[PDB]
From Swiss-Prot, chain A:
Protein name: Protein M2-1
Biological source species: Human respiratory syncytial virus A (strain A2)
Record note on what altering C13S does: Complete loss of binding to N protein
Residue segments, region Globular core: 58-153
Family: Belongs to the pneumoviridae M2-1 protein family.
Pfam families in UniProt: Pneumovirus_M2
SUPFAM superfamilies: CCCH zinc finger
Triggers of expression: Down-regulated by cyclopamine. Expressed early in the viral replication cycle.
Residue span of region Oligomerization: 30-47
GO biological process: regulation of viral transcription; symbiont-mediated activation of host NF-kappaB cascade; transcription antitermination; viral transcription
Keyword line: Activation of host NF-kappa-B by virus, Host cytoplasm, Host nucleus, Host-virus interaction, Metal-binding, Phosphoprotein, RNA-binding, Transcription, Transcription antitermination, Transcription regulation, Viral transcription, Virion, Zinc, Zinc-finger
Effect on the protein of changing K74D: Loss of RNA-binding. No effect on M2-1 association with inclusion bodies
Amino acid sequence: RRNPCKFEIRGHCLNGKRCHFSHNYFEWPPHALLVRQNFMLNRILKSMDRTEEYALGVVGVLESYIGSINNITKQSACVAMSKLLTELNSDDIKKLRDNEELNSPKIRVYNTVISYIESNRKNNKQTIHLLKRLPADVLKKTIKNTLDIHKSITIN
Amino acid sequence: RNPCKFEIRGHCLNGKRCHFSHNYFEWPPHALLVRQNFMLNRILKSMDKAELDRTEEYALGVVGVLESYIGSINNITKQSACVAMSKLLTELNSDDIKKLRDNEELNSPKIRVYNTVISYIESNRKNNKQTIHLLKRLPADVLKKTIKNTLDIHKSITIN
Amino acid sequence: RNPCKFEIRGHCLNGKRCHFSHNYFEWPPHALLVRQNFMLNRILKSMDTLSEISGAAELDRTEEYALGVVGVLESYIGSINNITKQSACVAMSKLLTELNSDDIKKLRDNEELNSPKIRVYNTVISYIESNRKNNKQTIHLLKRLPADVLKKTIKNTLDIHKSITIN
Amino acid sequence: RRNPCKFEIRGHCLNGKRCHFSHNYFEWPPHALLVRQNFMLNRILKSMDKAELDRTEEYALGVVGVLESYIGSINNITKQSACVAMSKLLTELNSDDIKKLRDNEELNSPKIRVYNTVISYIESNRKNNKQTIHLLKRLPADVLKKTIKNTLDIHKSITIN
Ligand SMILES: [Zn+2]
Ligand SMILES: [Zn+2]
Ligand SMILES: [Zn+2]
Ligand SMILES: [Zn+2]
């Protein structure tokens, strides 16, 4: 039985006839089929959109900007903020807002984040401007909340 | 290594600090299935064209809102009803209706309604902003009829 | 909790009332598979001017639906079920869309040089490409063809379509 | 039990009521469901995409074959065709995987220069592949071939770990 072409697993094998691995999904085992869909989804999504800031992550960058370390400019923070908002989805926040009792101050912040997520989906270029207009101390508050929600959602 | 739960929902944002797997080849299948679902949802949201965001219109659902507007409860304005109608139409697909219309014998009155819903679904895909205008122009009693039929189809399709 | 069948087809719209699972992590794999298929269909539909062009709104009608695009096209060839030449050309467009050049190129590679099949493969391929660029005019082109040659082309395209799908 | 319609497996069955195979995902077995997603993903991707190397032997070569051939000046690969194929390769690559490799390098490793060069090419290419191909044509043959060779090496490298 021919094994699945690992190039095709990540998308499209580019070796033409030379390549002697399977490119025929019908004979692939399921796990390879699963993995490919993940790479292909990643590509689809990308399509409709420095060394230590990479190793930090968007979270690392943002946490660093808060503690004023690793030389994170406020501009870079705002951009990273945009990337974080994109990774979040309003519906998960709304779900959390529903668990809160009225006039809980958490509800104010949930709605603030939610409105940011929505500005960001419409036009991330200006959402980033907005975020830059904020005074440092309030931007950091917001970032810290967004991060906390982000962590929160992901562990339940 | 277990799969990064952040990555399962999309893209882990912790850089090198995160010590969970981000390598799809070593994930077990179930996680791979789940991630595709979150990612599909994102892709779809991403190519999409304010009252019913509010706390109780969220817990109602679009169906709840619409059923409430029909029975004149939970304070659902006619505007909010029309918007929700748009969200419902979006969730439906013409082909499933056409399949139902084919089971009907000629001059069955059901066929009229199926085609009405179908044309609404199509107006909606073209331009939901005006489809919602249209829907607002309807007299309350006929809008509610339409909504009710659309809801019945929606339920019907989903259980077979 | 079992998976919400509404969510299986996309997005459950019943809010808090609905007592079925909407949490992918607890769904069994088969439901997860099925949902991806409905969602893919929606995504694709969502990035698709046609039903404005003459002859197209026509084949939504009750029997042109039961025929299929293939049925319509095979009917136009045998001059039955009242298929206008306009409707044929539109259906042709829908068929071309369903095909992908790469699968044809793969077949062309199995042919030995100067095999006449290679000419027809390339004709279909070029049609597929006109169609992806601008299906509105591809349909015009197809209408300009003399009936007897259009029917030839349709027949070849259909044969490829069948051929690909069974290997 | 009805088997899954093989036409539907590749997308949308076009035979209407005549077709007696299942088109109901709920009764399909999982493997068919997996296969269909792959064909449908391919279609979706093709659908949001922005002539020489369609020809019979440039197809059997692949984009890699074309590029490797242009480097060794064989199989009659024009420099124009090389540049286009380069674009197709860049598209198949993703910056993030390169960044991951650049992180494994120690500072001032010359590899880092090349990783960033490729990365910036990938990004020009995603923005506007038409001009990325112009750029690539402006390069002197000997440097274009260097770049192509590096890109190919990365491409192979990523794919085997
Ligand atoms: Zn291969
Ligand atoms: Zn992680
Ligand atoms: Zn539900
Ligand atoms: Zn079928």
